[PDB]
Ligand binder design. Structure first.
Ligand code: HEM
Ligand code: HEM
Ligand SMILES: O=N[O-]
Ligand SMILES: O=N[O-]
Lengths: 182, 182
């Protein structure tokens, strides 16, 4: 039961890179494939362009009644139908991290409705949130979404809605890595 | 600016071990000294007995008005007179970590008054909170306190008040390493 996940862009992996969109700030080099490994990488293989890593952690903002709503409808990863995925690494500004817990919760849910908006796109979209600021990585979060092609248009709508939120005014680096399951 | 810290119990270090208290659950081996290093150490040196590590992280529970109170009084580390120190690794239960953010905040402060009680022992006591559950370590937190002998009795009071709090019903492993600055 290891909470560390690595994402290595390169020639090998379980996922074909469809495209990479460098939304904001320095991007990620285009590669053929992404290899996802659970655990800490011993040595990065040859012909790898980049390595991202993060860990699964405890809830930081969601309250019990939100967790109950998410749990009632959120799908599992690895659904046979979920052949599309998107890896989105995200970095938030130093202004964000300086803020107190009540100030960040108010932006996250009261002003931006992150959980309420996201719930609109379940059960179509499965997700996994990983943290990596505390590892000294270049991003603060590795977010992961997977879904069937039927939900691609919906997911693209969700992305536009989130980037218009107050919360995203604190995002200062973002890349979309679009993937297809091999 | 590396946020990782390592505490190596052994025969070298900047701190002499006065005593080790095996408060709850498996203890830590008694050693002569503790060595504190900033950064991640990959090879523990020979005739060291244990290594603890954690990182400095963002605020998880404190609200803005509590941060302002803490900042008004909390003392710096490495005060000339702060020749005593206590390193207290703590592990919380699986039931704690499964709880939602509002549930944990209400136990932490509304019921246990962690911050309000701690502020009573400032500015005598300087402190540093490190996290390590997300590193896969045996403990969840490494807490560090340092003060002059004048505040030894006050700090021992604080410990007894905290161990009787609702929050401590979720602690399942705890060790006190009492130190003296060399
Ligand atoms: C698909 C529906 C989604 C749902 C149901 C959802 C739900 C959530 C929840 C409940 C959290 C808080 C976890 C906690 O309390 O620690 C969270 C965090 C986060 N989500 Fe989402 N989310 C969705 C989509 C997205 C998308 C599309 C993105 C990025 C484009 C995203 C980026 C993030 C980030 C960066 C965080 C961490 C926030 C922080 O800790 O500051 N989420 N999400
Ligand atoms: C000396 C006065 C103290 C003050 C002013 C104080 C203040 C605080 C504050 C404000 C936090 C929350 C940090 C955040 O929001 O992320 C915290 C966390 C914590 N403190 Fe203290 N504290 C004190 C003493 C102690 C003592 C003596 C112990 C152990 C015996 C302790 C154990 C912890 C633990 C384990 C956490 C992490 C709680 C969690 O995230 O679940 N504290 N402290
Ligand atoms: O909900 N962001 O993984
Ligand atoms: O307040 N725990 O360092």
């Amino acid at each position: 039961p290891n909470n560390r996940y690595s994402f290595i862009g390169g020639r090998t992996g379980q996922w074909q890179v469809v495209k990479i969109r460098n939304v904001l700030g320095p991007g990620l080099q285009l590669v053929e494939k992404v290899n996802i490994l659970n655990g800490a990488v011993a040595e990065i293989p040859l012909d790898s362009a980049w390595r991202l890593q993060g860990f699964a952690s405890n809830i930081r903002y969601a309250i019990r009644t939100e967790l109950e709503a998410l749990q009632a409808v959120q799908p599992m990863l690895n659904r046979a139908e979920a052949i599309l995925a998107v890896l989105i690494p995200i970095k938030k500004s130093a202004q964000w991290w300086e803020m107190a817990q009540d100030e960040r919760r108010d932006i996250f849910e009261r002003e931006s409705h992150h959980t309420a908006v996201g719930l609109e796109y379940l059960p179509g979209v499965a997700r996994r949130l990983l943290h990596c600021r505390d590892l000294g990585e270049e991003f603060d979060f590795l977010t992961w979404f997977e879904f069937a092609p039927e939900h691609s248009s919906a997911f693209n709508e969700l992305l536009l809605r989130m980037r218009a939120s107050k919360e995203w005014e604190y995002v200062e680096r973002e890349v979309e890595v679009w993937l297809k399951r091999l």
